């Protein structure tokens, strides 16, 4: 991990990209609050399995103990799902693309509207900033490594060393894009500030997830992780 260059970081990250899963959405059924949220739980439940194996392909994640890996995922799983949702929905203004067969807007949304608008705002932000896929895979990896690091004698310094390299990697991409030295700083800050709101959405979402405690076996083992 610490020996990987910037281009080998991006390539490894891009190659680790999980697929986009489909929904069991039947368009011949006007969704309800229980119907639509059932599709989302089922989708997230299948997405989790891919995220777990995506994590193992994230540079430095395997170097950590089995104890710390569980911790990092329990804290950041909804953040990674959300930023992934936001990423897919970038080229669909006013809409959230939960799945290729599941495309909802604010009107249909909350078939709950507060968190919808936040995800839309975040997606508009990426659109306005013209977020690149190489930048996205970097941010998503950061979330996995940063969200649970200040929630742990013991080795936390290595995680910072990985984060620092992803920072360099992010800078290298902006430099290889022709941005000035000042522009690289500002954009880097703009990106990481998004993570603050991604954290916010995940918290408000998690808060709504144990409000209705729609529940699979893997989700419940992570819904108690925030309780």
């Amino acid at each position: 991990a610490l020996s990987l260059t910037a281009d080998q970081m991006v390539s490894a990250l891009l190659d680790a990209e999980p697929p986009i899963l489909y929904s069991e959405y039947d368009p011949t059924r006007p969704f309800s609050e229980a119907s639509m949220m059932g599709l989302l739980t089922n989708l997230a439940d299948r997405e989790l399995v891919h995220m777990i194996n995506w994590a193992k392909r994230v540079p430095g994640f395997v170097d950590l103990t089995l104890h710390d890996q569980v911790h990092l995922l329990e804290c950041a799983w909804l953040e990674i799902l959300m930023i992934g949702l936001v990423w897919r929905s970038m080229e669909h203004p006013g809409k959230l693309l939960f799945a290729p067969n599941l495309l909802l807007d604010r009107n249909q949304g909350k078939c709950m509207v507060e968190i919808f608008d936040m995800l839309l705002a975040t997606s508009s932000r990426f659109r306005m900033m013209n977020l690149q896929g190489e930048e996205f895979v970097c941010l998503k990896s950061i979330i996995l490594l940063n969200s649970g690091v200040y929630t742990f004698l013991e080795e936390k310094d290595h995680i910072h060393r990985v984060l620092d390299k992803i920072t360099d990697t992010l800078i290298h991409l902006m430099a290889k894009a022709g941005l000035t030295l000042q522009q690289q700083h500002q954009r880097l800050a703009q990106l990481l500030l998004i993570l603050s709101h991604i954290r916010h959405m995940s918290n408000k979402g998690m808060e709504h997830l144990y409000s209705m405690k729609p529940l699979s076996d893997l989700l419940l083992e992570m819904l108690d992780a925030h309780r």
């Binding site: 777990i52 569980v70 992570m222």
Partner: peptide
């Protein structure tokens, strides 16, 4: 713990 087990397999 499913997550712990799934990190193995």
């Amino acid at each position: 713990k499913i997550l712990h087990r799934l990190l193995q397999d």
